Ligand binder design. Structure first.
Ligand SMILES: Cc1ncc(COP(=O)(O)O)c(CNC2C=CC(CC[C@H](N)C(=O)O)C=C2)c1O
Ligand SMILES: Cc1ncc(COP(=O)(O)O)c(CNC2C=CC(CC[C@H](N)C(=O)O)C=C2)c1O
Ligand code: NA
Ligand code: NA
Lengths: 427, 428
């Protein structure tokens, strides 16, 4: 990649949530292997982010590559209307088997935001079919579910800046962010949620939350009793529960799915990211036959959704390989060992002036700071330490591949500890 | 593939816009090559659908395959936040160069619906940043732009059953479907409805959004290019942004590289997908002008607020680059022109069948519209029995084949269509 290439990127290529006028530095990556990203000039970086949490098996994984190349040899893609294929069937068999028993119907889609849109549409169509006037969603503050208009409508109105779309987005119900930590349970915490449930129980189509961990909305880790109470409340009121596990699914929090921490099953489950081992985009939204059949028996005769590339053979094959790796079960001790090391190596950050909080769960390690990070300056510092860490807001956090070596994880935590010693990289 | 596999699929796997309680049969596909799909039982079918518009180079294309395998060797994926890579840069260079001069800023995304959502958010943020009170979209009836919630808000309310979401979906403005045909003459009267809505709401409209020339899902309609010339001029006069959704028409399908070329106009925002990757896997792109891209970033947000996990996916970009490289040979132009002539010639006799309401053709799109709806299970079986994959929808029996299709293969497709409509058997 020439300098002109980089110039073109800066002036012509929009990057995720960043200015086209005040771009901060980008780093040119040529390849990746194991837990390392390789830059154009040869610099090798230990990946602390798993490419936004998806690459749980690292990069250039033999199993993943083999499955992908083999599916390309058969067919990378064929349409899913009136046709089915082995990769979709094998993938759906695994998804049904690995999730709670009631979740036995699968709607594959292209991305996390779309999987959330699908779950939302499922709930609305469900009630439309039952002839129940229910169109509200009840969610938590600090929640984040994606970037498309439906998903945006259930994101924290303050973090996702709902003022920008005030008038276009439907108005949903936002209970207080869960206060009890993953910590002791305080009954005082339920008051806000209960309040909204009592006043709006007749019109709520579904409750939607990220289980245990609220990711992009603040890397918050809350008490599982919340999920227990919400499942019970939904059960009593006849409301659907949507669990967004696009970030928490496939082992990240120490359990296969975060709902397991509370031993609850949602009515609708959204999955993505690590689904494909972070090789390419794919999502899945699972629900019950009660939901799936009711919808088909309604006025529309079917669930009204179906994107062009639905069921893409290549992506399904990658996902099959990713799930196959998890089948060994090795992730359980890998994540447990990571958790221990994170909790050990991040503890010193609690002596640093710039730190507000340190919290760890499975392969998620968070250092919350008192002031906003300088994302450009901190990223450069990290690159200089030979690590890839992408902080944002007041969070310097790690979500590494499950296969990361102790010495690699150590470089990440050391860099973090060093970074927070200095106002240098803040405001 | 076993029959148990088919049972699992029927009972546990949702398919696009189809019932779970009253299933229709699906056909198991094990592989595909050239312009053929290969069923699990060994039957080979000539593909008449291009897997919904996208597989313009067919299947198991050596150039696409090699490009995908090579990218896997480097990295199938890496995040795009604070990172860039060669496949993304090359693709964006190509996209900027092949589209109208003003369109030079590229937002890569995952799917067509997301690309439309991005276009719509761009329009909203553009006006929110100039301090103007514009949150409505003006679109045409019989339009389809995706099935995520924002996209649904600009789809035809009847065709997409907006009654199901009545009260949840924002109410946009719907001008009548364009009446003048690509085949025929322009009629000034066509404009009254659109002109009327514009005059009454010119002040609240953030953008006009349409599919140029061909409205796909909403009826496979083919309208007169004068429509786009007018819409461009009107948008220009009123200071309104024009969004062209070319997710279906892009990359040669209508006989021109982009359907906007039939009118020689450029939109402010252009959405692409489908054939972008040669139908190998999902990827989309929304391009806009410097004026739009810079204005948004200077707004309160400080940036365009969107960024999906797999944005810029190296693997998909590599496939898209290979697909575009194939189109650089220019061979598609004659290929599509020849397909067009053959479709016109061989579907023409369908116009004398009693079951046929209309026959219309543009580039590598051939449509036989019928008077009654098709019997899906029955007609699908007939087609497969003829050794062809044609998937009709409602009153439309259509062909959109890969550009590489051989005349003999194309002839089997048209023969089958003509045979399907000769009597009332496969209808209702
Ligand atoms: C829990 C959850 N649900 C849905 C989605 C949307 O999935 P997509 O595939 O459509 O993106 C996500 C997406 N996860 C994200 C993770 C990180 C960021 C950005 C963090 C920070 N602001 C930064 O700039 O780096 C955004 C989305 C999800 O987690
Ligand atoms: C013009 C246009 N714009 C947007 C989209 C959305 O792209 P996705 O990748 O998100 O799907 C598309 C393509 N989407 C569809 C087009 C038509 C249908 C209906 C098919 C019909 N039911 C049938 O069986 O034949 C569905 C999605 C597009 O063309
Ligand atoms: Na299950
Ligand atoms: Na251009």
């Amino acid at each position: 990649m020439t300098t002109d290439d980089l110039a073109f990127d800066q002036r012509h290529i929009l990057h995720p949530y960043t200015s086209m006028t005040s771009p901060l530095p980008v780093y040119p990556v040529v390849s990746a292997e194991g837990c390392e990203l390789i830059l154009s000039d040869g610099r090798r970086l230990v990946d602390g982010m798993s490419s936004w949490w998806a690459a749980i098996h690292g990069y250039n994984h033999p199993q993943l590559n083999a499955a992908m190349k083999s599916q390309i040899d058969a067919m990378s893609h064929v349409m899913f209307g009136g046709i089915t294929h082995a990769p979709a069937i094998e993938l759906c068999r695994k998804l049904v088997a690995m999730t709670p028993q009631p979740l036995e119907c699968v709607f594959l889609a292209d991305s996390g935001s779309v999987a959330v849109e699908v779950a939302m549409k499922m709930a609305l169509q469900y009630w439309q079919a039952k002839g129940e006037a229910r169109q509200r969603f009840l969610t938590f503050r600090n929640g984040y579910h994606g970037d498309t208009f439906g998903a945006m409508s259930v994101c924290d109105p303050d973090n996702s800046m709902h003022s920008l779309w005030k008038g276009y987005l439907p108005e949903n119900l936002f209970a207080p962010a869960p206060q009890s930590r993953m910590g002791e349970w305080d009954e005082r915490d339920m008051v806000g949620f209960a309040r909204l449930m009592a006043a709006h129980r007749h019109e709520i189509a579904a409750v939607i939350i990220e289980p245990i961990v609220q990711g992009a909305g603040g890397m918050r880790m809350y008490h599982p009793e919340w999920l227990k109470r919400i499942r019970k409340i939904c059960d009593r009121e006849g409301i659907l529960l949507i669990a967004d596990e696009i970030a928490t699914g496939f082992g990240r929090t120490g359990k296969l799915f975060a709902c397991e921490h509370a031993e609850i099953a949602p009515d609708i489950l959204c999955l993505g990211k690590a689904l494909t081992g972070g090789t390419m985009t794919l999502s899945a939204t699972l629900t019950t036959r009660e939901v799936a059949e009711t919808i088909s028996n309604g006025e529309a005769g079917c669930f009204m959704h179906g994107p062009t590339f639905m069921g893409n053979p290549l992506a399904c094959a990658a996902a099959n390989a990713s799930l196959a790796i998890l089948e060994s079960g090795d992730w359980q001790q890998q994540v447990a060992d990571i958790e221990v090391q994170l909790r050990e190596q991040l503890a010193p950050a609690r002596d640093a002036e710039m730190v507000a909080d340190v919290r760890v769960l499975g392969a998620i390690g968070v250092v919350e700071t008192t002031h906003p990070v300088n994302m450009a300056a901190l990223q450069k510092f990290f690159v200089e330490q030979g690590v890839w860490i992408r902080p944002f807001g007041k969070l310097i956090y790690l979500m590494p591949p499950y296969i990361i070596l102790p010495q690699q994880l150590q470089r990440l935590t050391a860099a973090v500890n060093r970074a927070v010693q200095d106002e240098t990289f803040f405001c």
